[PDB]
Write an enzyme that holds these catalytic residues in place. Sequence first.
Site, PDB file in Angstrom:
ATOM      1  N   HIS A 140     -10.570   2.983   2.194  1.00 15.53           N
ATOM      2  CA  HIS A 140      -9.735   2.187   3.049  1.00 15.53           C
ATOM      3  C   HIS A 140      -9.959   0.703   2.809  1.00 15.53           C
ATOM      4  CE1 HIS A 140      -7.231   1.241   6.635  1.00 15.53           C
ATOM      5  NE2 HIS A 140      -6.756   2.454   6.450  1.00 15.53           N
ATOM      6  N   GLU A 167       0.795  -1.227   0.000  1.00 16.94           N
ATOM      7  CA  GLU A 167       0.000   0.000   0.000  1.00 16.94           C
ATOM      8  C   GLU A 167       0.810   1.250   0.000  1.00 16.94           C
ATOM      9  OE1 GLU A 167       1.032   1.884   3.550  1.00 16.94           O
ATOM     10  OE2 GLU A 167      -0.724   2.694   2.669  1.00 16.94           O
TER      11      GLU A 167
END
Length: 109
Positions: free
Chosen positions: A101, A72
């Site tokens: 998210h 990420e």
Amino acid sequence: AVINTFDGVADYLIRYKRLPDNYITKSQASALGWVASKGNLAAVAPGKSIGGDVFSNREGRLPSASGRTWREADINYVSGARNADRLVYSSDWLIYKTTDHYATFTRIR
């Protein structure tokens, strides 16, 4: 200026096969006094955004392969607590963005 947009970062990833210089991992941030509850990333690491941490793809929302792992990077970050914008990029250069998210993703590279 910083590169920290979905498209800016994605194109940096695929061209240079690394995150832009404004990214530091959660471990490296911690090494500088970053504490999540504290919301202090910009206080300890001015200009920086979290990225490069492993993303485990636990629920398989993203595609798997042998040798493929995922990572990420934080997108649109400036200061204070972290947001819901992430790129997730794979070791063979699949790139998905999420704006919530990791709840849902769209492939972009």
